[PDB]
């Protein structure tokens, strides 16, 4: 009586677009960041969507593509979070992202994807540290 929903949020362009939409709506009220962080992140979030819009239109939304989206999505947010704005602490930042991610997926499809959030959060937190100092050249 519901959707299985156990898959990548990037599998459907409709889903991805709405995901980022709901994401920012919850993220904007999250502690740790600031409007400056949100602004940049929102724009980059669009680039994420644009890639999926293209994949679904070119008919190339294959698993191995989405695998790459996993890493880049996490690191894109990390680069921003690592800039230390607003609340500073990356701990608060990363925890906020995951809350918005799970909540946004909750509104888009109705189910929460657990594994995908676990991966992203650790990658964010990992890539962020390497973005605070210029070792990610």
Q: For each of the domains in the chain, give its residue range(s) and CATH number, in order of start.
A: 13-131 (1.10.274.70)
Q: How far apart are CA 77 and CA 81, in angstroms?
A: 6
Report long-range pairs for 66-69 (Cβ below 8 Å, ≥24 apart): 66/8, 66/10, 66/11, 69/8, 69/10
Q: How far apart are CA 6 and CA 123, in angstroms?
A: 21
Q: How many alpha carbons lie under 13 Å from residue 110 in its C-beta half-sphere?
A: 5
Q: How far apart are CA 102 and CA 113, in angstroms?
A: 7
Give CA separation, 102 vs 24, 62, 73, 97, in Å.
Answer: 12, 23, 15, 9
Q: Are 74 and 120 in contact (CB under 8 A)?
A: yes
Helix, strand or coil for residue 124?
helix
Q: Are 111 and 2 in contact (CB under 8 A)?
A: yes
Bridge partners, 31 (sequence order): 33
């Amino acid at each position: 009586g519901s959707g299985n929903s156990h898959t990548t949020p990037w599998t459907n362009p409709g889903l991805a677009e709405n995901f980022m939409n709901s994401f920012m709506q919850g993220l904007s009220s999250m502690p740790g960041f600031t409007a400056s962080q949100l602004d940049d992140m929102s724009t980059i979030a669009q680039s994420m969507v644009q890639s999926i819009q293209s994949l679904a239109a070119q008919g190339r939304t294959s698993p191995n593509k989405l695998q790459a989206l996993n890493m880049r999505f996490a690191s894109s947010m990390a680069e921003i979070a690592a800039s230390e704005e607003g609340g500073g602490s990356l701990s608060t930042k990363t925890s906020s992202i995951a809350s918005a991610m799970s909540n946004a997926f909750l509104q888009t499809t109705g189910v929460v994807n657990q594994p995908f959030i676990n991966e992203i959060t650790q990658l964010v937190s990992m890539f962020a540290q390497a973005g605070m100092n210029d070792v990610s050249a």
